[PDB]
Amino acid sequence: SVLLITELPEDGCTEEDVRKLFQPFGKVNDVLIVPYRKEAYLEMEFKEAITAIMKYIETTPLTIKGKSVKICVP
């Protein structure tokens, strides 16, 4: 349901940023951003987009502003 991405760009993280990157995978409702730790929390609508994100990362890392970020599960 909920994903965590860490190691965000030191300058260039918005709630809209994270949405744009992950929208092609599913319906994103709530996105929560805390810049103090350079991380954010996306709340995915269905559990199937989660397996879709994860199976994609085993070959190509997701990149925002050119920096690849690290995705973490509960």
From Swiss-Prot:
Record localization: Nucleus speckle
Residue intervals of the RRM domain: 1-74
Domain of life: Eukaryota
Subunit structure: Interacts with FHL2. Interacts with CEBPA, CEBPD and CEBPG. Interacts with MPHOSPH8 and TASOR components of the HUSH complex; leading to recruitment of the HUSH complex. Interacts with SETDB1. Interacts with HDAC1. Interacts with HDAC4.
Annotated function: Transcription factor that binds to cytidine clusters in double-stranded DNA. Plays a key role in the silencing of unintegrated retroviral DNA: some part of the retroviral DNA formed immediately after infection remains unintegrated in the host genome and is transcriptionally repressed. Mediates transcriptional repression of unintegrated viral DNA by specifically binding to the cytidine clusters of retroviral DNA and mediating the recruitment of chromatin silencers, such as the HUSH complex, SETDB1 and the histone deacetylases HDAC1 and HDAC4.
Domain-related comment: The matrin-type zinc finger domain is required for localization to nuclear speckles.
Name assigned to this protein: Zinc finger protein 638
Biological source species: Homo sapiens (Human)
Gene: ZNF638
Full protein segment contained here: 676 to 749 of 1978
